Amino acid sequence: PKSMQCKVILLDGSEYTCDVEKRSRGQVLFDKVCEHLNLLEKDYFGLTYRDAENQKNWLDPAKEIKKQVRSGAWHFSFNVKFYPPDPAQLSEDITRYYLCLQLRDDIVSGRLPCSFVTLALLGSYTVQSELGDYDPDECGSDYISEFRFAPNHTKELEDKVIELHKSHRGMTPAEAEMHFLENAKKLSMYGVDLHHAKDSEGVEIMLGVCASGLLIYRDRLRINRFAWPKVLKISYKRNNFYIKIRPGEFEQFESTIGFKLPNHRAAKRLWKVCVEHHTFFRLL
Numbered sequence: 393p394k395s396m397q398c399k400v401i402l403l404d405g406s407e408y409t410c411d412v413e414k415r416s417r418g419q420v421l422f423d424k425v426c427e428h429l430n431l432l433e434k435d436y437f438g439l440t441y442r443d444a445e446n447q448k449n450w451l452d453p454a455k456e457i458k459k460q461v462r463s464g465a466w467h468f469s470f471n472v473k474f475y476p477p478d479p480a481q482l483s484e485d486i487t488r489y490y491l492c493l494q495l496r497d498d499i500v501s502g503r504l505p506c507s508f509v510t511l512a513l514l515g516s517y518t519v520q521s522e523l524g525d526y527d528p529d530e531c532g533s534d535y536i537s538e539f540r541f542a543p544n545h546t547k548e549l550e551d552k553v554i555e556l557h558k559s560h561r562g563m564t565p566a567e568a569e570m571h572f573l574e575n576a577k578k579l580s581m582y583g584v585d586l587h588h589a590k591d592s593e594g595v596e597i598m599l600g601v602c603a604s605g606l607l608i609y610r611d612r613l614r615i616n617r618f619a620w621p622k623v624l625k626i627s628y629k630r631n632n633f634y635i636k637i638r639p640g641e642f643e644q645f646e647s648t649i650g651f652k653l654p655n656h657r658a659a660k661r662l663w664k665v666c667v668e669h670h671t672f673f674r675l676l
């Protein structure tokens with residue numbers, strides 16, 4: 393029975409290696425990674441891989457791994473797929489821990505923009521969880537943490553992390569991770585998956601996929617939002633993506649809104665993530 397080596401980058405930056413049978417469905421690999429992580433609340437997570445166009449794709453757990461990675465390496469990342477709007481309602485501290493690890497990468501990477509003060513507050517909770525109580529022996533006036541807090545580090549940010557860290561004495565790791573999440577969940581780009589697109593006029597926009605629906609970002613003052621319950625049908629055709637909106641009260645007709653994506657693969661990828669969000673957040 394022939395097996396393929398899988399390499400999975402974990403949220404702590406380490407690499408998990410295992411073997412699966414070459415005809416294995418994605419769920420097989422996911423279940424092994426989740427067992428390695430001691431993770432029971434698995435529904436919020438998934439594996440990503442890079443396609444031949446180097447685009448991030450979710451590994452479909454119902455489909456053969458070989459039919460998704462195709463010509464590419466069996467190399468994957470473990471990631472948050474569905475960002476819970478209220479992390480306090482998760483049943484296990486370890487779920488909140490992996491969510492914190494994902495959000496730290498969202499922040500450092502610039503995917504999750506954040507004010508100075510929120511960067512410093514999130515950093516201070518990470519330091520409290522991982523090192524415990526502030527110690528002045530491991531931090532003089534010139535201290536720079538090993539922890540990555542932001543897409544661009546400044547001395548002023550390091551100073552502010554330490555000032556807030558001092559305020560958290562006695563705080564336990566689950567308590568600090570909960571505080572981290574209570575702040576992170578309020579950021580305007582929390583759990584927003586962004587897709588470059590053009591509107592039916594050719595104007596460049598972003599489409600954001602998240603718990604609260606499909607968001608359209610246009611010119612700054614011009615942004616729209618379609619809550620999932622309002623969306624009856626999601627479809628794609630060639631380079632185009634379509635949402636069918638419920639008729640408004642007393643309106644005779646449904647309305648169909650169309651967008652242009654970079655290529656057919658990008659339209660199909662946006663369709664699949666929208667359908668998956670629509671199903672998940674309908675049930676959660």
Ligand SMILES: CN(C)Cc1ccc(C#N)cc1
Nearest residue numbers: 399400401441442467468469
């Ligand atoms: C770090 N390398 C040894 C293998 C690798 C490369 C890329 C990904 C992804 N996704 C996972 C694993």
